[PDB]
């Protein structure tokens, strides 16, 4: 949990317009930093939170701003271009709002929007900037120039696709979307063949979830995978003249949660109903197999309303104790471990089917065959989120583990660092006054012996009187104590998601 | 959570056998028994598992047996006595099981069972065994003598009662029963007035709560008091030619929890359809009210069967190995806390009412009206039961609070006692290897300046080798610390529920 009041109002520079850079600045580096750490932070976020007189209303509506803070020679430097979408592209030269995005309506003087502003990740030897869309943009990682823009629609039968692929250690991407049968399409990728062909002209459908509801998908923002099994979370946040994404959104009140596994080899979906309790849900942690039964670690929020209802910039923007009284009616968020049981035996009718030893999450199979689940809570703080989790992905990624680290929210407000054992529930926080971290993102040591052997990479948003505005933070990995910090002296708006890309 | 194994299986002494005294034994005593601690320990449980060569089945059984630790002088004498229940006499009498217990039927050769093994309770200046029928047994105090019989059908309209009343600081007495309306009745006994006349004669209903299923009642353990308002949990374990008690429970599979309140000074039911996942419930932990809310602290079990299938002497006197993997699909203990909101406005309608800034349980205002229900976690080990809590009831029954005691359940077997804060969620445990422990009963010190200024007594059953076999363990409530031990050298069986009798 944050230890903060914020009255200060600091925060607000998050959500403030800012300039790109014609070449990059060099920070000014305090601590060591690890000589092996050789390679480029990348991150996404909104950058222009209006086209001169016209707002953006919502957070996730300001214009994509790719940034880059870059370690060479010991010395790093920061560097952010606006990524030149067609939303971009069309504002700078009608000078206003020409593509609706989620939360604002564009007026004519569906056309979807391509705003890559939550993430980048690497498709074959490319990097491809995304929001939620059909449309993700290949950047170049070393310019931050915007190379082109590419429509999964041309390849693949998906309407959109999430923000949260995953990649395979070959470089294989899986990614889930929204498609007609309503229903959720698989998307695989393979990685670059000696051919050398573009891997998105290879992309197929592997596997189809069904959904709830005839004509109401569920919006996904995340999925599980494990080298064995899909796992999809079906949540009761449906969609269904000037109207915007936003406004398509609505909640069932009485279908809780719909839990979903697939064969990810045999490319099947398993028939089996795994219902709970509502609760909105952005980020899977990890999934990993536990002899029969799969542990689906997530970052949940206690209630059916969408959470996204909170994030308007209105309302981010407020003075503090506003900013709490806001978020007195939300969702609460909280850290769950659901255990899914792959074996299920009719015998067991009225049971817990859960038999691991070291585990409180349970599974009753009912008459009906519905499989009811309570989980086992990892963290829980009022209105304090563990969200943006990471992981040691590539060792650890789909795999049995024991390490997450988060962004700690405050009200919906960052404002900390946080590492939590899942085995013990411990957790450990950084924290200073009047700073507002982004996702921490894991670094491995290139020799780790541990799952936590690395460090953690996070953009901090400082801007105190006395104070650089902005730097990269960069933390032991162990027990998120300070190993340096790059500051730099620009304003650095709120970033979503990125990668570390090791060089 | 415990941190044994019990192979050598000395939890089997729990449920053995054993004699009554003739009159009172000195206890030896290792450390200082605190010079303020005067009174009685009273305590209920089976002593007598067989009669003859018939057994009885279950936990719930064998024939009920009234303890005393006796502190007086600085000196401390044990006595038992078994209660002179019709259930126990008339098996005397024909050297046979005569009367019907909750899993043992009686072949002849409905007659309610009165085996009052469960709690003991004062109403005026009289104290009374229980089980959960309508038959309780007047006992003495001091002798540990039966006294009478008393019959609740003859002066309230109730079918039974739990060994579970609440106590005012004037003496008043609630408890709660199933009835006819189905329904269940809260019972009021007044304090003893000057006319000296039996309070029991002046019971009545002050307030009914519904029933969720028409001809069949759930199982009701204990319910919830404040200043204000009472608390009953309707859960789905349900009450439908030689058949016992437990024959007639089942599971509800789509229920779920219902919970409802009443207003305890206007005697009104409140038409507030609270909804929750469903779970077995025994015991409530505290109840008290923060502004316009009840927080409702439960010894929760997550799923619909009924636990006490797992409690058949037989599974509980077989080798520790087998016990582990005979609770593997039994439900998870789990101390959950929720709140219930008073003041609903319907233009909530969708959102979380629960507004308090300290809690992280959640409250969702349905279309229809009802209102899901999500717990903050206080507790949770895998088949780690805090279970059997006691508080310091007097000064913090209905109350504002911050601390429980429990006993910890190792799979079922008692094997430690836990002090759980249950705000911050930090907890003590005293443990010693084959040692089984019973519920910790609070006494307060007399110039307690803080709620845990005082003792927690437990009998213990430490049956190795070279042991005394069991001993009145007395620890600070302040860290579970020992303070004194009161040896005997006799065995003791398994004890349920009591009290501490100041004088
Ligand atoms: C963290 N960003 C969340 C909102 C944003 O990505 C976004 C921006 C614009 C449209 C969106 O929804 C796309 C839609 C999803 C359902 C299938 C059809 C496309 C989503
Ligand atoms: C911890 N003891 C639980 C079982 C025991 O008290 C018991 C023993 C015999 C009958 C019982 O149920 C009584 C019944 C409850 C429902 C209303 C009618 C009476 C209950
Ligand atoms: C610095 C990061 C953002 C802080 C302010 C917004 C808080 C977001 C809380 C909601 C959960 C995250 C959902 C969106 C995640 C995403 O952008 O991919
Ligand atoms: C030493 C205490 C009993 C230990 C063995 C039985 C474990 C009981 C676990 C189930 C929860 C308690 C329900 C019955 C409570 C009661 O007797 O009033
Ligand atoms: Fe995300
Ligand atoms: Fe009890």
Known sequence: SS?????????????????????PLTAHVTGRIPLWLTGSLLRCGPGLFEVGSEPFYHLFDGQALLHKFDFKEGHVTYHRRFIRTDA????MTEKRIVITEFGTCAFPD????????????????????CTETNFITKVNPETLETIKQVDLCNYVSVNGATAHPHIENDGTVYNIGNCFGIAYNIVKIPPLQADKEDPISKSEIVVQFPCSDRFKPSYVHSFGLTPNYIVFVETP?????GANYMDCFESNETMGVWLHIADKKRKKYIN???????????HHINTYEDHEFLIVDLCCWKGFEF??????????????????????????????????PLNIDKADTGKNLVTLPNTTATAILCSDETIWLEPEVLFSGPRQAFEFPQINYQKYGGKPYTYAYGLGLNHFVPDRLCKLNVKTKETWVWQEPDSYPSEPIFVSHPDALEEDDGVVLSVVVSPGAGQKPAYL?????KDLSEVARAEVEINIPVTFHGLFKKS
Chains 1, 2 share one sequence.
Request: glycine share 4%; hydrophobic share 40%.
């Open 237 to 241: 946040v449906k969609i269904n003249w």
């Open 473 to 477: 933070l960069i933390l032991n990995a």
């Open 88 to 91: 971009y592209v069309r504002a």
């Open 272 to 282: 089996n109903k795994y219902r709970t309790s509502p609760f909105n849900l952005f």
């Open 307 to 340: 959470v996204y209802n909170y994030l308007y910039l209105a309302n981010l923007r407020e003075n503090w104790e506003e900013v709490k009284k806001n978020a007195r009616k939300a969702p609460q968020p909280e850290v769950r471990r659901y255990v899914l």
């Open 3 to 23: 230890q903060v009041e914020h009255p200060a109002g600091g925060y607000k520079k998050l959500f403030e317009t800012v300039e790109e850079l014609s070449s």
């Open 110 to 129: 569906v056309e979807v929007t391509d705003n890559a502003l939550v993430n980048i990740y690497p498709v074959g030897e490319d990097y491809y900037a």
